[PDB]
Design a protein around this nucleic acid. Structure first.
Lengths: 59, 128, 60, 28, 662, 101, 94
RNA sequence: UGCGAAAGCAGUUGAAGACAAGUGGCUUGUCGUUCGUUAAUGGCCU
């Protein structure tokens, strides 16, 4: 994963999520590591609200 | 009258120290407030009175300090916003020129107590 | 005339006076009964809005 | 007069809606 | 001179709280928006507005009620192939069914038990539940035709008043009561247990006060009942087994109204703590586990929410909500938390309550059953008429020269001579029993003596007698929404009038020959009409915010380039222009206004080039100047060649949900 | 001492301004009417000083509008005038027995 | 106020006895502590009356720019004879 | 930021690059970019 901002691994250690910064903004990708059970990714603008884009950077 | 003469002189371009002198000539409290109420902008009256009260923080004339306290009462929504490059060090050196009186008001009140004690026991022991 | 204007207004407006043992009610008009729905029962409307403005919800 | 000057200086140290009907104008 | 502007805030015409929202057609996501969809808004002073959500919510008609009249619930009924029918309860023992043409009650069915607290309509809309104060649930047979209502069956009684009703289907009827319980009756005819209450459920009571179940809906995709009560808790109950699945502790005070979408993936809910909560079940795991989650929560209203409803179609998916603060709020259904919202103005005066006369510089204004008159000078209230022989008011007009006022409601009208006696007026009734018997919508004063009267039963008299008026082709939308072919507007000065009905028909009339010469020539609902004596023109503006003008004895070249050279303010306008007049100093410039702006278009110039009902659904068929610095706007007019009259509005306890303090 | 300790807890803890934000004429008169009594005591007068200073900092327009707290500010002015005469004459007694050491 | 008239006279008259006493501050500690806590806060209420008096004469001079206007500004009215000519049922009556 | 005492005394506030919006440029604003300078109604357990 060629640019990582933030990362976390599940409690069983069976999958891990992280952030990307791949362009307009960052992105979020989850991947199972002990199997190719699941690996998905999406830009986090689809997570974020429509209110947050006209608000402060903390939002 | 002479307040209008001082107003016209201080409003034209020049003669600011002589303008404060002409303001000190008639020197009414009501006209002192009126000369602040009339004008719409100042030609750094705060700057020249800042340097005057900095060079004399101990003068017996109440004229320029009365003018400064009424200027700060009536126009301080705009003195903090007219200019902030030389005015910053202006208020800085004015504030440091004036803090010493706050430092030495207790010793002057102490000496006033001293002298009242001395003069009252001297009035007391007056040899019948 | 200031202390009885509402008295003479209501005593000329209202109907169904007494006559001894009896009471002579006016029947209403098809005009009003077909132009408007009847008035709200102020008992139940006061019950509902007094509930929604009870003291236990601190309005302000 | 020294305590008066000192009191005034120390004062300087510590010193450092709609009506119901208007009438206005707009562009022709 | 330059324009001197009288920004008046004297008129305190205030509407009342929205108590019931309803949509005429049900949702049907995968089909187009029908051309007959109307939202109905019953207020708390007793008037029922009917809005059309096409192109940013214009208001078609208003049905006013009078003194001490309110309206608590209202339901639509449209059997497929027959006209829309609108029933409504007030605070009384009757149901009131209204005919949409006249704007009057056509039926006051006294329900045979107690004071009605709630009303609901059967699915397939042949029966009507009224839930009453003495614990009764009364069924009213609706399917006999529009107007005729029969009593059917009083369901099995109880002690406490039933405050909300819902139907499962044609079969069962659910009712939340004021003892904290939720009963389930069977209204299935020809069963053994018809009318008896099958189940009773009890919500988690408040510790220190009584609990009332305020809102009950049925959710048909699952098999649940959603219920909001006065603790703020929202509970979901399995219908079979009649028992709770899950309870959420959502609001801080009562939950007055809650609703759902078509496929029951969302439940929206609101009450006196003025937040709207959204409970979602959209995940495949949520649908296969029957587990709602408390998804989101929005704070949009100012005081309360007393009514909430939802519409969802192919080009329309919005929930509509209103409360104690008098404004309406539109949000998106499937995009509630994410998307945007629109808070409507508290009044958009499609029917005016204020007009001025240039002589004596005076202005009349009528709220409910009183008129008031003041003059400019400052300003001075010269006279008023709190006529209490009246019960309801409607439109009003003054004579030019300011002599005679005429007030007029749909039951009668009355004409008053006025004489300025100095710092006061003297007002005297002048009797005319033809006026005292006629129904009036609009009176518009041909002369100082002659007026033209539009009756609520589509008659156009000329008094102080009869205009021939041709008939309109009755299509499916005209038989569905039964007021589309009714005269909305008429404007007149100097013996030449023009009327306007909302099918897109605007017909001139010479007052001499009293012949039509129709110029229908339109596509949708007509917002306003004004006649220009210069150019010999009529000026119509429709709901799409386009300005057409036509000549008299079709549209001019100024219209032909103006309509598609129209400014960006008009192209992004949200509030429809409800009033047009012409300038007084120039006979050719015209000056118009909506509820949040004031514009003026120039008669000759042309400028160069380079949350709605948005589908392919049809309409109801099958120097330039712009300002908005007087935006809470009620009425504007002119007095003389340089001054302007801008009369507007200006402003109650609410549930304190405090902003963060620092 | 209980009014003093809740004033001091709001002063140390958060914000005088937060505690004073949504006020108007009718809801400030308790504070200033207590500040009249608290300006006399030594133990309260620092807290009374900064609370009165903050409330005239952020309610200088209500000073103009309402006349029925103008008079409360004037009474507070004469109170601080009496107290400043007392705090000056105490310094004079302090000097006049500093002379006698 | 009233009692320190007594304490200034005790120092003036007995100015020899309590200068010949060996521990003045230790013997009349309570006077020293009382006057120290009375005169210690003098800069604070100096700043308080400066800030208070500034706003006080600020609104005083702004309201003295228009102090005569509120003496005849109230021209308010009530439900006048328009109400009598308004009551249409009472206009059919009287 | 430095020296200081708790007062105060001296110093300020550049550049690059990328992106976003508005009208390939131009303007404005940002930066989980670099170099230099001593410098979202969202509150506390039983």
């Amino acid at each position: 994963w060629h640019n990582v901002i933030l990362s976390n691994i599940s409690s069983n250690g069976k999958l891990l999520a992280h952030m990307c910064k791949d362009v307009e903004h960052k992105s979020i990708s989850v991947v199972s590591l002990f199997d190719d059970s699941v690996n998905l990714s999406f830009p986090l603008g689809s997570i974020l609200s429509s209110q947050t884009q006209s608000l402060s950077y903390n939002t | 009258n002479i307040l209008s003469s001082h107003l016209e002189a201080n409003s034209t371009e020049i003669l600011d120290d002589l303008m404060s002198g002409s303001w000190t000539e008639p020197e009414i409290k009501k006209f002192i407030l009126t000369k602040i109420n009339t004008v719409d902008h100042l030609s750094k009256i705060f700057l020249t009175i800042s340097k005057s009260i900095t060079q004399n923080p101990w003068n017996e004339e109440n004229l320029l300090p009365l003018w400064l306290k009424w200027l700060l009462t009536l126009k301080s929504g705009e003195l903090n916003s007219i200019k902030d490059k030389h005015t910053k060090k202006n208020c800085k050196h004015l504030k440091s020129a004036l803090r010493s009186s706050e430092e030495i008001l207790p010793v002057l009140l102490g000496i006033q107590g001293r002298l009242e004690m001395l003069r009252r026991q001297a009035k007391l022991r007056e040899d019948l | 005339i200031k202390t009885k204007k509402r008295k003479t207004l209501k005593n000329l407006r209202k109907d169904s006076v007494k006559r001894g043992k009896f009471r002579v009610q006016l029947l209403s008009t098809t005009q009003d009964s077909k132009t408007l729905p009847p008035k709200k029962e102020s008992s139940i409307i006061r019950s509902k809005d007094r509930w929604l403005n009870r003291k236990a919800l601190n309005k302000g | 007069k020294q305590v008066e000057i000192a009191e005034r200086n120390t004062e300087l140290w510590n010193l450092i809606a709609l009506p119901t009907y208007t009438m206005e104008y707009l562009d022709i | 001179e330059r324009m001197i502007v009288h920004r008046c805030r004297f008129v305190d015409f205030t509407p009342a709280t929205i108590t019931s929202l309803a949509f005429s057609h049900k949702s049907n996501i995968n089909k187009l928006t029908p051309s007959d969809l109307r939202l109905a808004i019953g207020r708390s002073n007793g008037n029922i507005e009917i809005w059309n959500p096409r192109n940013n919510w214009f208001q078609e008609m208003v049905i006013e009620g009078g003194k001490d009249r309110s309206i608590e619930g209202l339901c639509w009924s449209n059997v497929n192939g027959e006209s829309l029918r609108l029933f409504s309860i007030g605070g009384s023992t009757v149901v009131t069914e209204w005919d949409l043409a006249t704007g009057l009650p056509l039926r006051n069915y006294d329900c045979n038990s107690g004071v009605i607290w709630s009303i609901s309509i059967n699915d397939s809309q042949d029966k009507l539940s009224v839930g009453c104060d003495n614990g009764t649930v009364v069924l009213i047979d609706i399917s006999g035709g529009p107007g005729v209502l029969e009593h059917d069956t009083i369901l099995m009684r109880q002690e406490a008043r039933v405050l909300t009703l819902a139907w499962k289907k044609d079969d069962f009827v659910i009712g939340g009561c004021s003892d904290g319980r939720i009963r389930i009756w069977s209204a299935q005819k020809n069963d053994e247990n018809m009318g008896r209450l099958l189940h009773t459920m009890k919500v988690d009571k408040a510790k220190k006060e009584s609990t009332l179940v305020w809102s009950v809906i049925y959710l048909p995709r699952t098999d649940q009942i959603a219920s909001g009560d006065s603790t703020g808790s929202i509970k979901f109950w399995d219908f079979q087994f009649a028992t709770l699945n899950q309870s959420f502790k959502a609001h801080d005070a009562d939950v007055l109204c809650l609703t759902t979408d078509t496929d029951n993936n969302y439940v929206f809910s609101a009450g006196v703590d003025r937040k709207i909560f959204q409970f979602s079940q959209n995940t495949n795991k949520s649908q296969k586990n029957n587990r709602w989650v408390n998804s989101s929560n929005r704070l949009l209203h100012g005081n309360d929410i007393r009514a909430i409803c939802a519409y969802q179609s192919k080009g329309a998916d919005f929930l509509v909500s209103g409360g104690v603060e008098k404004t309406l709020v539109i949000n998106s259904l499937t995009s509630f938390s994410n998307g945007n919202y629109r808070k409507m103005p508290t009044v958009e005066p499609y029917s005016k309550n204020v007009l001025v006369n240039k002589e004596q510089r005076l202005v009349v204004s009528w709220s409910e059953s009183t008129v008031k008159i003041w003059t400019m000078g400052n300003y001075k209230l010269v006279c008023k008429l709190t006529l209490k022989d009246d019960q309801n008011i409607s439109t009003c007009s003054l004579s030019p020269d300011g002599q005679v006022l005429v007030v007029g409601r749909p039951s009668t009208t009355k004409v008053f001579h006025l004489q300025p006696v100095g710092n006061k007026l003297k007002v005297t009734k002048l009797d005319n029993d033809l006026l005292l018997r006629t129904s009036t919508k609009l009176v518009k004063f041909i002369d100082n003596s002659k007026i033209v009267i539009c009756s609520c039963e589509d008659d156009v008299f000329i008094v102080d007698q009869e205009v021939e008026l041709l008939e309109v082709t009755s299509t499916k939308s005209s038989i569905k929404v039964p007021y589309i072919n009714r005269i909305n507007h008429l404007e007149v000065d100097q013996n030449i009038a023009v009327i306007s009905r909302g099918c897109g028909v605007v017909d001139i009339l010479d007052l001499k020959a009293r012949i039509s010469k129709p110029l229908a020539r339109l596509n949708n609902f007509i917002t306003a009409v004004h006649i220009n004596t210069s150019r010999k023109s009529v000026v119509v503006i429709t709901a799409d915010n386009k300005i057409y003008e036509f000549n008299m004895n079709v549209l001019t070249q100024w219209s032909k380039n103006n309509t598609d050279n129209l400014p960006k303010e008009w192209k992004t306008l949200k509030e429809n222009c409800v009033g047009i007049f012409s300038d007084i100093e120039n006979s050719s410039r015209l000056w118009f206004w909506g509820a949040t702006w004031i514009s003026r278009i120039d008669f000759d110039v042309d400028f160069p080039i380079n949350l709605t009902i948005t589908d392919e659904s049809n309409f109801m068929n099958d120097h330039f100047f712009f300002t908005d610095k007087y935006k809470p706007l009620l009425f504007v007019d002119l007095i003389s060649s340089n001054e302007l009259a801008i009369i507007e509005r200006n402003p109650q306890k609410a549930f304190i949900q405090p902003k963060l303090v620092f | 001492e209980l009014t003093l300790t809740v004033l001091q807890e709001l002063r140390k803890r958060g914000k005088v301004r937060v505690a004073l934000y949504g006020r108007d004429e009718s809801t400030l008169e308790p504070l200033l009417n207590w500040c009249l009594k608290g300006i006399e005591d030594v133990r309260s007068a620092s807290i009374v000083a900064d609370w009165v200073a903050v409330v005239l900092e952020l309610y200088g327009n209500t000073l103009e509008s309402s006349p029925v707290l103008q008079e409360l500010m004037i009474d507070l002015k004469t109170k601080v005038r009496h107290e400043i005469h007392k705090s000056k004459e105490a310094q004079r007694i302090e000097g006049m027995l500093q002379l006698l050491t | 106020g009233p009692l320190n008239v007594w304490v200034k006279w005790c120092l003036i008259i007995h100015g020899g006895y309590l200068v010949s006493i060996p521990n003045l501050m230790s013997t009349l500690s309570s006077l020293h502590s009382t006057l120290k806590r009375r005169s210690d806060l003098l800069p604070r209420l100096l700043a308080l009356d400066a800030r208070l008096d500034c706003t006080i004469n600020k609104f005083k001079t702004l309201n003295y720019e228009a102090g005569d206007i509120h003496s005849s500004e109230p021209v308010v009215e009530e439900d006048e004879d328009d109400v009598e000519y308004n009551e249409e049922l009472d206009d059919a009556g009287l």
